[PDB]
Amino acid sequence: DTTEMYLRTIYELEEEGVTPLRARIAERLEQSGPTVSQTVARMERDGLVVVASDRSLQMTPTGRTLATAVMRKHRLAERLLTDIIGLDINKVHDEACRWEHVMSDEVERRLVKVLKDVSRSPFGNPIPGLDELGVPGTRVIDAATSMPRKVRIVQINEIFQVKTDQFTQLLDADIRVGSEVEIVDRDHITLSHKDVELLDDLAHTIRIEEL
Amino acid sequence: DTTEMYLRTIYELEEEGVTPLRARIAERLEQSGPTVSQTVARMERDGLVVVASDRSLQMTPTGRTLATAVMRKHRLAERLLTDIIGLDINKVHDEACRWEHVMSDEVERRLVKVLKDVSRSPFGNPIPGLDELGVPGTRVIDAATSMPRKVRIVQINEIFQVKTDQFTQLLDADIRVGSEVEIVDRDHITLSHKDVELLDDLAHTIRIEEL
Ligand code: NI
Ligand code: NI
């Protein structure tokens, strides 16, 4: 389904921290602007995407769920193809781009059993959706949900910190008040600008807003 | 490509010894007669099939080559899915029906390396095309090409045989003068009606024609 290829392309552009504009989508899929526009209209009617006022495509909860599953199948296919089949690594991504459309959930569950590790694709990116498969401003500690979000730093509050080893890590990552960074919760909290895994005191006292 | 699914269906019906009529094709693919007819017309223009005077579809050399490759990919997929992945055996055929369309030759070559044996599918049928992948009347000894063909028995010539252990095997298989049987050459010659692997004396003296 062309729908799956559009949703996965949006997913991938978002992971790369690129705004999912229609022209970006068109260019990545090697499809015309007008063709992309016609497909985006069908996808809005289907409830999978909305076109935001800055013209970027924002996937709905349903659109995002489907996108996520397509990416999971793509990445599990890449692991099968490299770890077990041994297809030349230069061909693995293009093979998996086809296989992601035809792999059942049942095969994915089997792949999770058989593969050594399903943490990441061979190309370094996390395999999403495995839980779904079945097996002032605000303080960063609070504002962080569990999926990555771009936010703006308002206070770092160095003056209140007892532990200071991360001051330089923040500097080396160019995180200052004003920096736009992506924040994430884990099984410990993390900032992206480089990746800084915050100890609790900092996570409790650094503040983030959003425009 | 719908073309691949039509050619593989023809292949499969032929293997089952069924005449590949358009209605049989329609029924197996769960497509309408008129839809099948429109696709067969495109396939004739493309040079992949001819419609014979008995209305059966006869694949051209090119059509047969493509059909063969689709079947090979289907069967290698089934071996991957059962031997390595362990997908529940009741789901393997339907999964492979999708995978046969997206598997590259390069993955098939890898599967030949990794799998224990690629003689047959899990469902008992030979994996064709591996050589292409890269790794009176006439006497039966002569008339047999290397691919199976339906022929008619004209003489068995029992009277000239020194070895007679196969007389009963032929009887048990219902091969008599008049029987329509499919003959095949191997790396030793064989008759099908049951399968009788002929010793040379019989293969040299049994005669076959065709209407
Ligand atoms: Ni990839
Ligand atoms: Ni099958």
Curated annotation (Swiss-Prot), chains A, B:
Name the Gene3D superfamilies on file: 2.30.30.90, Iron dependent repressor, metal binding and dimerisation domain, Winged helix-like DNA-binding domain superfamily/Winged helix DNA-binding domain
Q: Cite the Pfam families for this sequence.
A: DtxR, Fe_dep_repr_C, Fe_dep_repress
Signal peptide span per the entry? none
- InterPro entries in alphabetical order: DtxR/IdeR_SH3, DtxR_MntR_Metal-Reg, Fe-transptr_FeoA-like, Fe_dep_repressor, Fe_dep_repressor_sf, FeoA_core_dom, HTH_DTXR, Iron_dep_repressor
SUPFAM superfamilies xref list:
C-terminal domain of transcriptional repressors, Iron-dependent repressor protein, dimerization domain, Winged helix' DNA-binding domain
This entry's Gene Ontology molecular function terms read: DNA binding; DNA-binding transcription factor activity; identical protein binding; protein dimerization activity; SH3 domain binding; transition metal ion binding
Give residue ranges for domain HTH dtxR-type: 1-60
Cellular component GO terms, alphabetical: cytoplasm
Where found, per UniProt? Cytoplasm
Q: Which UniProt keywords apply?
A: Cytoplasm, DNA-binding, Iron, Repressor, Transcription, Transcription regulation
Subunit and interaction comment: Homodimer.
Kindly give any further remark recorded in the entry. The N-terminal region may be involved in iron binding and may associate with the tox operator. Binding of dtxR to tox operator requires a divalent metal ion such as cobalt, ferric, manganese, and nickel ions whereas zinc ions show weak activation. The dtxR gene was functional in the non-toxygenic strains CD95/211-, CD95/305- and CD95/407- isolated in the United Kingdom. These findings demonstrate that, if lysogenised by a bacteriophage, non-toxygenic strains could produce toxin and therefore represent a potential reservoir for toxygenic C.diphtheriae.
**What family does this belong to?**
Belongs to the DtxR/MntR family.
What is the recorded name of this protein?
A: Diphtheria toxin repressor
Q: Which organism is it from?
A: Corynebacterium diphtheriae (strain ATCC 700971 / NCTC 13129 / Biotype gravis)
- Organism placement in taxonomy: Bacteria, Bacillati, Actinomycetota, Actinomycetes, Mycobacteriales
